[PDB]
Amino acid sequence: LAPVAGLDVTLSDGVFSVTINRPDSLNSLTVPVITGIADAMEYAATDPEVKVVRIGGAGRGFSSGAGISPPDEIILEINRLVRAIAALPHPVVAVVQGPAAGVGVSIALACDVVLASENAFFMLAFTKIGLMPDGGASALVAAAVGRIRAMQMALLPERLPAAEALAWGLVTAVYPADEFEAEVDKVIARLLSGPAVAFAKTKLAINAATLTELDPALQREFDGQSVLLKSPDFVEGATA
Amino acid sequence: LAPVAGLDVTLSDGVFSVTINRPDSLNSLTVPVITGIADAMEYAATDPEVKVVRIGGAGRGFSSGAEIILEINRLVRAIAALPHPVVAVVQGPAAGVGVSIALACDVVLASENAFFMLAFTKIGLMPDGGASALVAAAVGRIRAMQMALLPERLPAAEALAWGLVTAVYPADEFEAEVDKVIARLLSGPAVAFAKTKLAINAATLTELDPALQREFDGQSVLLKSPDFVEGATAFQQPNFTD
């Protein structure tokens, strides 16, 4: 597997771990990073040494989203990345220690388990800069919290705090910020000692029932974002 | 756009507003005025100076609800397909299809004072307006059955906790908070909002159109059945047997 700058990928004791490490950019994502994540997830599905996956961010925040600083390519890699999380025949754990915004939220909600810090908030930032949701957020969000709440995060984006995310059913768990790394470790270890084949078949089955709209949604997002990206309102969006 | 008795429609500042004005019926619905809402929503879909749509009711209540089915269905598909944010403004009770109209919208803003009730079943009918899908899509299947089979006035605050409503305000802050939200929408990117709303609807409302059809087929039968007669009558002044 090829190494990628701003991204640490390690496999230890069946825990495939993928950490985005651009702590100066608040873990914003660039095409070659999105691409390495996609590659790693696709890789993880093929390696019989993998039992549990974990994706997270170093520093203060999980990810600020796609780097706001050819255009269709970013959308295609983001889509290829989400498909790969959703297909992966193991438990995927998103470790959300700080803020997650735009695509960061989508990546996390493509995952199977979402572990939040009291610190963390979530924001579907896209309309703030003249874009629409990406990475399947058109389905992934509503698949967890329902329609009205999805519509709300997307048209009236706001820093949704962890405690509220959990009460909406958007995250699996919230730990106090001083206990977070320890509680996350206990979750990974419980999963690591679980029935690997039953976990695989359970994750795939819930996803086949709850994500029948993922692919259609990725097709629309590609169609829609691709116009919005090459459009005037977004040039203004990125300026401010 | 033809003016319609019992309905006010305005295009001020890029804000398309539609208000049911029959505060004596508690904003009850008829063919002519349903038809009007429907026409106006279809109008607002292509008028290139519209940015945000707004449905609401005069006075105390939002709408107390009810051929009539078909025009309701046309109304609902028009909300769902409108390529702008449509906002439900619910200052007081919303009953029957009134609930369905509000839930078809994309943002539901509610007063401390507001209440939602799907009480078709009390009078021998089934839910309408796509409620057999719109409710579940927001709050899931178990809560949806509860409202349909065990109807109860659902105060705004619980509705919010469930997640069928976007926001609840105190009666005395209500209109001001509503206008901040509208104003917030007006400031936003109009094409990105249109694609966002339509994308989210395509993911969540795949069962809405078939639901409109099954409802039409079902009410049709139930509307010309004893249990409706008996149920309509016992509200006027029930013993159901079908």
Added chain:
Amino acid sequence: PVAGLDVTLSDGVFSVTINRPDSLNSLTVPVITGIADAMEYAATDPEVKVVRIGGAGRGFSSGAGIDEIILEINRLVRAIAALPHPVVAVVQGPAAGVGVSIALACDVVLASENAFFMLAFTKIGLMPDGGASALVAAAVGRIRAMQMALLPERLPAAEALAWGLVTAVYPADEFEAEVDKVIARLLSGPAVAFAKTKLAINAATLTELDPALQREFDGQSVLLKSPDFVEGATAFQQRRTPNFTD
């Protein structure tokens, strides 16, 4: 006529009560076959207006006792979803594994404050069956379904109400009387509006129930005849931590 299972019709009220209190209303194949047959019977019979499932004594059902088991689970679950009457689950205590699936296939779920829910399958090396891969998410959404399934915990009634998983919670000492009120109110309601209401919501929300049941069959078939299952059931029998290796 089935051992461990009482079926009764009253004044339009078809009760179905598992009676293996000793094992917390465990489910054998004969008995699963029974509830299934009973649910199918109740769709034909014009005297039936409301249907209640429950289990005797402390528990509701601890699920499958511890292949045809799955085919019949599936039959049962389809029979409940297809039933043109309100079907009520009366949960006075623990619900585990397919016990939960059965509850969640119902239309109305009434719980005691004593009750809890747990998708146990995974503690013993199985996947969710009985449509649980569709039915749980259909009520509470994907993140929560996945949590219950991958990190099973005893989810107490009251937290199940907040999630949207059940219709109502009652204090234990008030539970039986309250169930009765809800049953009677439904008895008094219009039967055909109810039937159509039920089926319309089911048809909008359970679009994936059938595909789920199929996947669950193909998946459990493999898992039940695997080494992780024996390790799990044994370890549960022994009140012991399992060591999985598959």
